[PDB]
Amino acid sequence: KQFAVIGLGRFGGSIVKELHRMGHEVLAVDINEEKVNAYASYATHAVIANATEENELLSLGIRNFEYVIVAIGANIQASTLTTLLLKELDIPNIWVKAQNYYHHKVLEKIGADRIIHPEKDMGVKIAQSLSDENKQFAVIGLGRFGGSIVKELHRMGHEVLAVDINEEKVNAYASYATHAVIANATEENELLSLGIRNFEYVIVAIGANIQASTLTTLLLKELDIPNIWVKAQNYYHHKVLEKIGADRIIHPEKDMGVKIAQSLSDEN
Amino acid sequence: KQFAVIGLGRFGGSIVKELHRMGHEVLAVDINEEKVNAYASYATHAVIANATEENELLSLGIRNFEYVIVAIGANIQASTLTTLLLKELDIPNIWVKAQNYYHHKVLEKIGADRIIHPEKDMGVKIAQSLSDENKQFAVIGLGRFGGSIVKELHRMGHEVLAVDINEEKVNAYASYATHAVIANATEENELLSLGIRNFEYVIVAIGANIQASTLTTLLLKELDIPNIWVKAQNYYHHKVLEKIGADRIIHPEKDMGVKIAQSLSDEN
Amino acid sequence: KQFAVIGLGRFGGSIVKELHRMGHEVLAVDINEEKVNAYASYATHAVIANATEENELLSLGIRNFEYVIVAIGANIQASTLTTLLLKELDIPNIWVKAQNYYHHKVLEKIGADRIIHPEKDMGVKIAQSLSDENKQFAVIGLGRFGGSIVKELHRMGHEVLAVDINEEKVNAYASYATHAVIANATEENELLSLGIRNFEYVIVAIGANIQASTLTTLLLKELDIPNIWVKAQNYYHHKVLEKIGADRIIHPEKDMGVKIAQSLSDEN
Amino acid sequence: KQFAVIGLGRFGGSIVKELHRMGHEVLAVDINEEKVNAYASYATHAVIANATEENELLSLGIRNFEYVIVAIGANIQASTLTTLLLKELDIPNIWVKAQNYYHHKVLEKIGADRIIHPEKDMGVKIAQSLSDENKQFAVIGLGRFGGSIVKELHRMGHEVLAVDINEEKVNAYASYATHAVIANATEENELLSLGIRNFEYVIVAIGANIQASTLTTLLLKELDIPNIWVKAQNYYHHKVLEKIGADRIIHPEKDMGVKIAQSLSDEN
Amino acid sequence: TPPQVLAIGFFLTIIIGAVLLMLPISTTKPLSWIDALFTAASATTVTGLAVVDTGTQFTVFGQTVIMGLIQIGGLGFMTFAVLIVMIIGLVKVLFLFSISIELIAALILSIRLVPQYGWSSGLFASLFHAISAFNNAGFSLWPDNLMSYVGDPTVNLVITFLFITGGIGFTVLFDVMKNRRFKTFSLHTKLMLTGTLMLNAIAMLTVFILEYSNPGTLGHLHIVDKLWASYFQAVTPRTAGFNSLDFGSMREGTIVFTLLLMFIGAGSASTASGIKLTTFIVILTSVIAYLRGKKETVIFRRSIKYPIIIKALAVSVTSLFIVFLGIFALTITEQAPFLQIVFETFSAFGTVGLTMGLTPELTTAGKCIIIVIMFIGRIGPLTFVFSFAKTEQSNIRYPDGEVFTG
Amino acid sequence: TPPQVLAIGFFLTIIIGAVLLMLPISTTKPLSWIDALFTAASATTVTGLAVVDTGTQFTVFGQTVIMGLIQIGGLGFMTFAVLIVMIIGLVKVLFLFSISIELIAALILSIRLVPQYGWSSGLFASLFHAISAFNNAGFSLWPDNLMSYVGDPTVNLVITFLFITGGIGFTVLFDVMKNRRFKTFSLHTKLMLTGTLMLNAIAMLTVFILEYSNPGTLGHLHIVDKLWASYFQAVTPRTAGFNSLDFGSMREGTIVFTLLLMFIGAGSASTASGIKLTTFIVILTSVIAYLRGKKETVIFRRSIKYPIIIKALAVSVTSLFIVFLGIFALTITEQAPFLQIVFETFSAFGTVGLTMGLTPELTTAGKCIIIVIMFIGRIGPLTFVFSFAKTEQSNIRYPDGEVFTG
């Protein structure tokens, strides 16, 4: 009934706006005010507070909330110490956004009721969208997202042409894909020689700078790739990719928040 | 009759392929071989040589060429010392690509029969294309190119809303434009507050990184700007700006080489 | 009786060698083998293991050790998750090296029997060495170490001329010192104008690059400063500062480990 | 009789001070005023001017000066165009500071009466000081200075243990030295295994970061190296190396100017 | 240390075993001080040579100790894959699995057609050969050295499966077990299966074409007995050491191909080999890629990284460089034919077992060196040199050095 | 194209020269269709083999065509080397410098102790051998193939200097000229001088220790005549082709070392070789570094870059792989001893010239293949394969492939 989301990052902002969309009370709160300002009309109560101070948690009546969400990115100690305080107020259900693998383990021993990996848990959902959408699968960029789709599609039993810019990731994904390839998706000859033309589903999950993501898809659309699915970064990345011919665009940080905002609504 | 182009950069490559297109003999030559390879069928004779060594200029019969073109970019000494050697072989007409202002002066006292500024001389031609095309003119990015159009459009007597990322350039262009403005073309509010929507002709000459060039035009096209003219950098920058809605794209060195390759053909 | 130190950094290496010096058994262990090799005869048992894996904590008989020391610097999660596992094995006394302030809080709710701030806790010990050594006090560089001495000396009731390169620290230390000054210790005029000649005890706690530390002490020795105390970084820093005329050199982690190695010895 | 030095850099500053020391008229002048201020009492006439403008050369009576010195570093065109103007005023003797090899060539065809390479021409003089000083020679850092001493000492016929941080220089100096070695002078084991102890004369010409210069000498002084000669950068680099135990310190910028200031005096 | 332990340690099982058999209980006729440190060296190196015949000269005590030394040589083989795996818990599996396939394929499948000699010579001769077959020894009981079982279906089918699978590396042994899929085998395991069978086809073809009309061996055999020889003749130079036909009465060309066929070992782990099959493939196919323009050496669309190239080259030249030293130091020691001196050395270093009739007629001076040949070859030319090699670490690079070789 | 032109082009000088000699003017006794395409192939390949004796079977015209054909072959290598150097103006020097040291060291220094036979056979026999010596041919006039000049000082001193320097790279030929300093020689040139002389000392020691008591050749020669043979027999396996003593009456061990001594060519630029000396050094010393620890193969404190390693390995295995094919494809073709079949092949592929007495008794079936051996070995195994090798450029990389070989 009473919902509260801490940390207005990309993930924690996509749950405050979605839970408010259907019509549920959301106690949004972030460490500074720059984000809390733009979310003044996107939540039941917008608050500027630091989730590490005890008196700011009590004065906020946070214990009346059966569902607290910690989406503070960047420094992990802000994410951990928060849930450490929440588990002391006997919060019924605390949901936390973890960063790496060890963050999963430490939060599990604190008492974190739920842990969500926006990049990982999204890849397994996209790897289900590509499976139920139909043969030839190819994922470019073995980031956290691009690695969770190569790992999942291979689990179901589908051919995956995994390929990343360097080999450090392609090495650990040698037994995680049908064909692990070390290539740069911006070079034409590396796209042709890889027989990428034969792949109806290309996934550009390259992270970091946008040009590697875009130029890839730009080349893919030239090879008449039937369905190109791309991992975008910011809003302008969506618009430009939409005008290139990107058949599908996925926001791991945003699209996951709307799914979690559906998991908290149907949970009561 | 006999044409020879030294340095196969973007400029020196656009004159070798153009003069060869009509059907004129071109002795293309550059310091490395990486470029001379791709221009083996784009010239009458592709040669790998350093234009600073005497024996390589003599053994190439360069003296038989009444028109030698020094397009070696990057460091200037390769450009200067070349023409310095060429003016010793009594070359009838030496045409040189200068870089900055002092390059113009030093090459002038060497004996350079002609000097070309690809970024500058192109802006004055575009400032002629925008004038004969029709009222409200605005040029973003006060680079060498974007500065040569604000200077020339204001010269004839047309309103120019000059604007660049930083103020260092906007200062020197205070009396060179109808309105000098310091703004970042990536921020929407700075584009709206500048009344940029009223300008039928927006010029994005922000050089260096491409995202500042692109994102700008992406915003401009959202404001339904009638005619956006953009300065592209590489081949892929041409493709991406084309799918955004760029009403025209200008390659300062490429488009200038074809004009010089027309000045050398009609000169004899 | 049973001593074990995890993480062979500068702090955790100065306790394995000190406890081994007196004649106490030390179970040294670090994440990589690069350090475990050099400490093969500096401890009772040198082991290569990762403190986050359970099976490597059990197979090492770590529970038989009443005193476990977590000195793993750099990432905090390695420091935290370790103590989290240690407290599960009912370790009698766990001593941990915290990094920032929040690290102190989170480690306190896990069950850490003791927390040591090598930079901070050493400043308060030096602030006692300077007090019992005699009038005019001045500390350069408001780092973690240099901030822990301006606050301690001001507590007893001694004049402190605090000064840092920028103002961000000097602002928070305006009421923590007799005089908060914003200055760069490399400029002669800023040293003369601050009346630094009248101070018999100068402390250079500027961390990070060594040249700022050295050059300061170089200038101080020119004004005939009676006693200069410097925070060195590496071994060569100790040597070069020694040939400059540094009256005192302090290694906050090294000198703290030998004190903790004495607190653990006399604790049983 | 009439002397004038253009550009008050490290080189052009060390000539204005030396010529004024013995007692000769010096028309010092630099592009801006920051340098011309400190040299107001260091020259017969301190002037703020740009040597590329004709009217500034005429109004200064520069033609009355038989000896003009262009010491303007950084951009080469400022150096070249200056001498280009001077040769027009029929300046009897123009001496120029060249930067790279092509600068030597282009200035040579302008009419430059003399060209000086401070880093190069100094190494050949040091290579003469080490020869007449006695057997085992070793030069660290194959910069322009450290490369001109390995090239010269090998010319007369003396053993040179050339060694630089990376291989790119040690490759081109394989037949220019008795032993070309690729090593970092900051690692102890690389200094011992190279038998550097057997070398009575070690030269640290590692430019760029001072710490590689210093730390090297710091190590060398530990090996009881009889005579360590070091290339310092700034004034403070002179003081710190002096307290380490550097037997000799050379300023290629400064020390060469006092030699040219002696060449222009004894020339009339 | 890991290298030196296997060098001097494996040397002691030779010496101690050379007195376990020189004892008057295991030797009927006087065993000279020379012919005792050799035959005990050949069983522990699982080589297949012997100055004296093992079945008649040695009693039941002289044959069981040979079996034990063969088991010892198979164990040191099991150590080399434990080295391969890392680059304790397995040690249970490897030896237990040895005596498993060694018993069920001997006292059950090899005792089917050998119970003829009774139970005093049918129970033992069916078990003695599998400890030597599976281990790729070459030590046979009857003096015929399996020559009597030319076209016996049981022998050629049972014993081959012993030194073949026993001859492939532990990896492919262990890999096919838990993997078991036609497409999930790793690079190395997928290599062996292909190269093993494919080469046997080239080998059975070679022996069958050249020894087809040879009236001495295979020439007058029946149509079915002609396959049991060519097949077995072409599967036994894999350091097996069994004779289906005699090698001292064959065309000169066949012996040549065997010198190469016995030179190249079989399997990395193997059971015994001079230069493992994997080494030959890599070296050869890497050159084939040099004639093509491919910058890198890619196989099975899973390109091998550069280190495997130089190590294969080292093991390659070393075996040749040593076998050459043997052919040289034996042509002068003993007045013997040249074709036999070359065959003997390739076999001695390969622990191959096939001998053209020179091993009984080995002199003393040529023995001590030959004992080293089988010693160096079994222990492998790489893990053997690492012992007495003072490892040196260079920290400083040096200028480029141009040099022609074309 | 640069590879193919040298392949099919050098093939024509063989064919055209094979009719320049079978003409009834140059042949006394009938020259069969088989023994004509051979001897003309050996001179152009400067190999040193011949089905028929060159001095008695061929008239003045025959020896002239052989002689001039050898000059063409040495010129072809002279171009072969120059191409290796850079990867027109010199072509004057090299041929002019050829006929210079070929004339001043023949018609002046070789006509000193040969004017005995008159001027019809003393002026010619002193010029014919130097175009063959300096080019490392092995074609001698008198049937004894220089056996008559066992210990004559003029012969062992004049001819050796011809095929040694001619046999070292034109690099070290050209290098010592303008450099001329003891310390300024490049890596490759400094290599040759060391490896050339040093190996000759090992080779004279070998021939002198083994052929010392051998009553056939060298056993009962005088004390001084014993050095003129051990030395010369130690320097003639360098693709020279001259017999100071007969090889068909030597200890079996001596012949063995020669197979290796003749296998390794001498110098890259050189005069003719199966696998140039530089190749052997690199391959071997690169392994010596592996057995220790140096992360790179550094020689003379001027480390060679990685590409030289793979190319040297390629030239290595190719020569062996082909020579083995020859030894195999000849043991069956002709009923000959085994030691001679192996000696012949190593020599045929190295263009070595030393023959144990099998070249006159070569059958027809074994000839057309042997003609290819000298053809392939002379043209070098690398620049010969690049012709009919469709060069294939790989642009995409592949995953790591684990595989062990120890």
UniProtKB/Swiss-Prot annotation, chains A, B, C, D:
Residues 1-250 form the RCK N-terminal domain. It comes from the Bacteria. Homodimer, tetramer (dimer of homodimer) and octamer (tetramer of homodimer). Part of the KtrAB complex formed by an octameric catalytic ring of KtrA and a membrane associated dimer of KtrB forming a potassium channel. This is Ktr system potassium uptake protein A. GO terms for biological process: potassium ion transport. The keyword Transferase does not apply. The keyword Lipid metabolism does not apply. It comes from Bacillus subtilis (strain 168). One of its GO terms (cellular component) is plasma membrane. The lineage of its organism: Bacteria, Bacillati, Bacillota, Bacilli, Bacillales. Belongs to the KtrA potassium transport family. One of its GO terms (molecular function) is monoatomic cation transmembrane transporter activity. Keywords: Cell membrane, Ion transport, Membrane, NAD, Potassium, Potassium transport, Transport. It is a peripheral membrane protein. NAD(+) binds at residues 10, 30-32, 50-51, 72-74, 97-99, 103, 119, 144, 164-166, 184-185, 206-208, 231-233, 237, 253. It is found in: Cell membrane. The gene is ktrA. Disruption phenotype: Impaired potassium uptake. Catalytic subunit of the KtrAB potassium uptake transporter. The 2 major potassium transporter complexes KtrAB and KtrCD confer resistance to both suddenly imposed and prolonged osmotic stress.
Curated annotation (Swiss-Prot), chains E, F:
Disruption phenotype: Impaired potassium uptake. GO terms for biological process: potassium ion transmembrane transport. It is a multi-pass membrane protein. InterPro entries: Cat_transpt (IPR003445), TrkH (IPR004772). The keyword Iron does not apply. Its main location: membrane. It is found in: Cell membrane. Keywords: Cell membrane, Ion transport, Membrane, Potassium, Potassium transport, Transmembrane, Transmembrane helix, Transport. It holds the Pfam family TrkH. One of its GO terms (molecular function) is potassium:chloride symporter activity. It comes from the Bacteria. GO terms for cellular component: plasma membrane. The chain crosses the membrane at residues 5-25, 32-52, 65-85, 88-108, 122-142, 157-177, 191-211, 247-267, 274-294, 312-332, 338-358, 369-389. Homodimer. Part of the KtrAB complex formed by an octameric catalytic ring of KtrA and a membrane associated dimer of KtrB forming a potassium channel. Integral membrane subunit of the KtrAB potassium uptake transporter. The 2 major potassium transporter complexes KtrAB and KtrCD confer resistance to both suddenly imposed and prolonged osmotic stress. Belongs to the TrkH potassium transport family. Ktr (TC 2.A.38.4) subfamily. This is Ktr system potassium uptake protein B. The gene is ktrB.
